[PDB]
Amino acid sequence: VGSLNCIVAVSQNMGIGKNGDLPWPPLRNEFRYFQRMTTTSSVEGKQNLVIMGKKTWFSIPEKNRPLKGRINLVLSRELKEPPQGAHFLSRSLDDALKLTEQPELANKVDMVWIVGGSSVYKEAMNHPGHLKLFVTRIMQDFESDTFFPEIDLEKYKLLPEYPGVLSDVQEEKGIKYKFEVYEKND
């Protein structure tokens, strides 16, 4: 099993969600970036795994789930089996990370990508170890009911460049945004 990473898009006011959807109008190319980064494995014969909370799973349009070309794992303590279309269900983040190391998935899983929401991000971000955050900075305020946790810059270093990640300002639907990659190792 390869690297552990979080990926998020976030507004200036740290918003990630509103009413079970994104706070901003759909950004097609941002979604294409998310798909590209999470799907692409750097190892032959292997697949990346995505971990998400229950509400995140149901926020994804049915036509886009499961997230194609990746193993889809949902976190829930209420569910008794994986949701329709999903591949796996775990009851904690630790339990999910162990499952990747079982004979089942040990040699099929390359990268692990936590794709939301807040509580999964928080726990991952504050757990000791090697972790990268792929953060899309939406450069406006958007009314939100769900927020990204604090990035501690004492631990997380913003990388000055990263292969496959554009460094200039993007714009869709009159909304500017930029891609960032952070790395910690503790």
Ligand X SMILES: CCc1nc(N)nc(N)c1OCCCOc1ccc(-c2c(N)nc(N)nc2CC)cc1
User: Which residue ranges make up the site for ligand X (CB under 6 A)?
Assistant: 7-9, 21-22, 26, 28, 30-31, 34, 56, 59-61, 64, 115-116, 136
Half-sphere exposure of 97 (CA within 13 A, CB side): 14
Q: According to the annotation, is 46 in a ligand binding site?
A: no
Tell me which of 4, 30, 97, 133 is the catalytic residue: 30
Q: According to the annotation, is 28 in a ligand binding site?
A: no
**Residue of the chain from 29, 42, 107, 119 that contacts ligand NDP (CB under 6 A):** 119
User: Which helix or strand (DSSP H or E) is residue 156 part of?
Assistant: none
Residues 6+ apart with CB under 8 A from 186: 128, 129, 155
Amino acid at 94: D
Question: Does residue 59 bind ligand NDP (CB under 6 A)?
Answer: yes
**Residue of the chain from 73, 93, 112, 124 that contacts ligand NDP (CB under 6 A):** 93
Tell me, yes or no, if 22 is annotated catalytic.
Answer: yes
The piece of 38-46, 74-82, 104-112, 159-167 that touches ligand NDP (CB under 6 A) is 74-82
Q: How far is the CB of 45 from ligand NDP (least distance, A)?
A: 29
Backbone angles phi, psi at 118, to 5 degrees: -55, -45
Q: According to the annotation, is 15 in a ligand binding site?
A: yes
Q: Are 105 and 49 in contact (CB under 8 A)?
A: yes
Q: According to the annotation, is 76 in a ligand binding site?
A: yes
CB nearer to ligand NDP: pick between 119 and 167: 119
- Structural tokens at position 82: 């994986």
The interface partner of residue 61, options being ligand NDP, ligand X, none and the CB cut-off 5 to 8 Å by kind, is: ligand X
User: What separation in angstroms does the CA of 95 have from each of 17, 98, 169?
Assistant: 26, 5, 38
Tell me, yes or no, if 171 is annotated catalytic.
Answer: no
A 10 A CB-CB count for 78 gives 6
What residues act catalytically?
A: 22, 30
